[PDB]
Amino acid sequence: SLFNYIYSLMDVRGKFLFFSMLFITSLSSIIISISPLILAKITDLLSGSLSNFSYEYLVLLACLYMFCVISNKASVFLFMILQSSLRINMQKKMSLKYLRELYNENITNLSKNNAGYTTQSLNQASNDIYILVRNVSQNILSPVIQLISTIVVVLSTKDWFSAGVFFLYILVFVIFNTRLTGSLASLRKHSMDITLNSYSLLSDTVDNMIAAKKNNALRLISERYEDALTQENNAQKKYWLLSSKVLLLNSLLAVILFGSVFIYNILGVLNGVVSIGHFIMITSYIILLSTPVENIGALLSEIRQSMSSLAGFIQRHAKLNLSIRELSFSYSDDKKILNSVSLDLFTGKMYSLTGPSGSGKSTLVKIISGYYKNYFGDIYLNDISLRNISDEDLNDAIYYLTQDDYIFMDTLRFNLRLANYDASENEIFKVLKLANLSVVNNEPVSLDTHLINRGNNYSGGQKQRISLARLFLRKPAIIIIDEATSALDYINESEILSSIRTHFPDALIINISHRINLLECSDCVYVLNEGNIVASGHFRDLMVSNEYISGLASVTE
Amino acid sequence: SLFNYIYSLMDVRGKFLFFSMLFITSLSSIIISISPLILAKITDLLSGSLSNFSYEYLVLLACLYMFCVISNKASVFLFMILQSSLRINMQKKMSLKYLRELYNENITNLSKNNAGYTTQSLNQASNDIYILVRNVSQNILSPVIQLISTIVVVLSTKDWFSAGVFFLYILVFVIFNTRLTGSLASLRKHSMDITLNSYSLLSDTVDNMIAAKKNNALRLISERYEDALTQENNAQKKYWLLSSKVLLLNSLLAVILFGSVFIYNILGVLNGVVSIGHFIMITSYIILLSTPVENIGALLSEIRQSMSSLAGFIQRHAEPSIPFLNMERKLNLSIRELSFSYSDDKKILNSVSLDLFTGKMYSLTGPSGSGKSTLVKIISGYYKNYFGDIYLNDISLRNISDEDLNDAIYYLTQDDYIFMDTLRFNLRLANYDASENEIFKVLKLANLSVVNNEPVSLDTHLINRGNNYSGGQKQRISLARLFLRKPAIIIIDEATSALDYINESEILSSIRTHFPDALIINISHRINLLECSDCVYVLNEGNIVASGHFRDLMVSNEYISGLASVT
Ligand SMILES: Nc1ncnc2c1ncn2[C@@H]1O[C@H](COP(=O)(O)OP(=O)(O)NP(=O)(O)O)[C@@H](O)[C@H]1O
Ligand SMILES: Nc1ncnc2c1ncn2[C@@H]1O[C@H](COP(=O)(O)OP(=O)(O)NP(=O)(O)O)[C@@H](O)[C@H]1O
Ligand SMILES: [Mg+2]
Ligand SMILES: [Mg+2]
């Protein structure tokens, strides 16, 4: 499942580059596994006679050893060039898949993480893929070829002690390291998660740096980050201590077992039972074997470490008449936000909704917008349930102007093209007049105006006008205005709301406001209090009967 | 400049670990540079003698070669363990320095770049320090010892051709690689900057993902990112192609010059002019020299690459107050001919003259372009590049420190800045030494003591941008922060807009009662807030068009007449 995802990230070019890395590393392993027999033939030849044909043969063997070294050094440079070229090839498809994965996630899941967390999650996952790609193509065929060749030729020389101890080392190595690889993977995954938590805390402090600066308390903001970095260091030191203990125990086992083979051949050469050519062949195999053993040690650890951390990443990723009947909602089971709210709204009519901050005006309208789907009750559109409507169809029929502004760090043209991609440059400027954003500071507005992070190069009211302009480019049946014109003066506010009603005449408009101006101009007003509709009717009728609406009208005087 | 900054990042433990890495790498280089002489002596002892060589001396030499190999393999493992331990040691001090560097920057410089850019900037800079630490500890003493040793012993054997060509190789290598290292550093820095630009665009799409989702246009958001990644790939391929061309030219030079030395000693051994012991010593030197040459090639490139990219980071982030000034209890604001521009193209505020006094509530209004927020941001000390003068009790704003100004003036911003932490953390931002009972008293003052008919716990975790609380409930957190501070001037820039008439009027009354001797400046487009004030100021197109009582301005002023038409 996880390997399938990695194989899908590479294109036709990526497949070739991956198999070229696997081929080059396998071919190099065959060539270098011949080297110790060449040294053995050089060594014995030196002890013997030194005829004309013995010097010519020595020179030939010296060239073969040189070719063996050159082939291995050219293969590590070719693996490097192909590996980096494959990194470039895979990263574009990996990043685009991640962005499209985030687009398909629900609002609740999106809001629980952080951008700094999100960008660093891609960094950790992309690294794990790079690690896994390297370990297959490089640490599979290459070490097996070299370990098999070593045992085969040492068995051929009838040296049962060397071939036996060499086999014994691989057998103990694989058993011991796989018995501890699970502990290394857990400690590394736990460290990487704390690392993500440290990035979210840094990202959070930088986004609210203006608030931290004006309230001072550099002590408070830095202590929070210092405690996150201390948790990060302790988790890193735990992994460091275990991995270094494994490296030292694996090194100590190598000097005992391979050292025993070295002393056995030393005593063999002294007593006259073993030849110098065979002794040099054995010592050169001890040195040769270190590289494949290092690759097996990395293969076992990096596959269990990167597979564990990449498993966590994949898991994390995995004419309209509105009729709301007995709608009940809770964010957490502990506390009830909306209880049995029953409404019946009709096309072409402008409705108003008000109440205190805890009543749940935004929640109710977010459920109509399809932000949250875990609700008890029924919401219909022309006798069609919201549950039976797709998110794409609901986004076309209903347009929700959020309480908070979401301005993209790009041109004004990009911010308006978010509402409609096929919009002509003349059509976008027509929408600017409708949003009263055609002229700013007695100079015309250009669509190429670059807007900085959070659109803070524009005033609060000017940001609201960008969001209102996006509405004019869409074609909805239901329009929801959740305190979207609060930072506008009475002139701009009334001018834009009239433009919404004229351009969208057959539109069900739901307006959330705490001001008399917006409540008076509506067909019907609904008072939501502690999650339930306490009062309903015309604004003038509510002024007398309802206490909350009455007190709102007396603020004008 | 740069190296001093890196040396300061290491503590007493970091200094030891760094010099241990430098020592272990240098010691190992001496030991391994002996190895080709041991092989020469093995070869000579066997060569010629028909098994009449001393076996005891052969065994001793075989053990010395084995020790030389083991010492070198133990040194790379010790370097690894010390390097990773030094990475852990240095990263905490590096990250804390970066956060405190960002705190001391001005608002204009912080608004230039997104948090995704900020987090990735630390990633790039921390990597560059790691690279530079490795090159100075492992790529300086180790290759010089090995290159000097090789030339010295080959000169000792009177082999002027091998010693000459080996010197020729190093001389051509250093000249050719340093003549291209400038091109590599430029291409890599340009690639790393495009990488930061890609991270800012991803971070920007995720922060506005809800807006992208509800408007659809996955096409638009993905195409923006696809074009950023294509710019990233093209910049990477440019560097890849040049570095691989350098590697192939350096490799081809090595097979020509070191191949010439190999053939010369081959013909020397065939003709009988050179010994086999000397031939093996020369070939083993050819093999040995690859590792130091690789380290010199890395030293030249990685210092010019990492120093170039780390210079940009230091430049962007790195680039007269009264000592222990005692601010008065009661402060009067005197703004004389204040003029301000964000960019030289247009004037935002022109010659605005005000005189506000302690204990009095003033109102400020006008259109969106007039600059109410900008004017009050300048009083708050957001921007310092202004023409004119602003005084506090005949003390210039320029002569007041940022910490003293933040104590005397509290500015309630138009936008809410809620920290992703507990409610206690969000309120302790205003005062660190606040008692748990004192913080709950402030919650009543902000009408945030009870929510949803249940008492508020100070341990309530607030999510990203505090979006687990309503828009009005977020404003109450900001208002609660005011009650924990002790200011002389309070500025309310549309800070109660998302509150109903009950909460709004209840909180504003609580502000005036708790801070009686406070100069209050209120920005609003609503009649409710303008009527309740001692004096109203109309700002239009960057200048004060009208000043006086609300009733006097109601008739005369055009802007306030447009507001009065509600009923
Ligand atoms: N994401 C969330 N998780 C948990 N509780 C939430 C969340 N969003 C809102 N609430 C709570 O739900 C209640 C209603 O929130 P909301 O619907 O935003 O308020 P509102 O009635 O629109 N008020 P206002 O926007 O301030 O004018 C409050 O008690 C909030 O704290
Ligand atoms: N950072 C900035 N860079 C450039 N122009 C800016 C910046 N901030 C504000 N402006 C412009 O300066 C003018 C005044 O901005 P600002 O001080 O926020 O407005 P305001 O008078 O508070 N209006 P409003 O908040 O909408 O009721 C407008 O033309 C803005 O576009
Ligand atoms: Mg709301
Ligand atoms: Mg403003």
Author numbering:
A (entry chain A): 8 to 325, 342 to 580
B (entry chain B): 8 to 326, 332 to 579
From the paper:
The long-wavelength beamline I23 at Diamond Light Source overcomes these limitations and extends the accessible wavelength range to λ = 5.9 Å. In this study, we report the determination of diverse protein structures by experimental phasing techniques carried out at long wavelengths on beamline I23 at Diamond Light Source using S, Ca, K, Cl, V, I, Cd, and P as anomalous scatterers. Native-SAD uses light atoms naturally occurring in proteins or bound to proteins. We demonstrate that long-wavelength native-SAD has become a very compelling technique, where a low multiplicity dataset from a single crystal can be sufficient for successful structure determination, making it a general vehicle of choice for experimental phasing.
In contrast, AcrB, McjD, and A2AR diffracted to only modest resolution: 3.4, 2.8, and 2.9 Å respectively (with corresponding molecular weights of 115, 65, and 50 kDa). For McjD, two crystals were needed totaling six datasets of 360° and an overall multiplicity of 54. These examples show that S-SAD is not necessarily limited to well-diffracting crystals and the method is applicable even to more difficult membrane proteins.
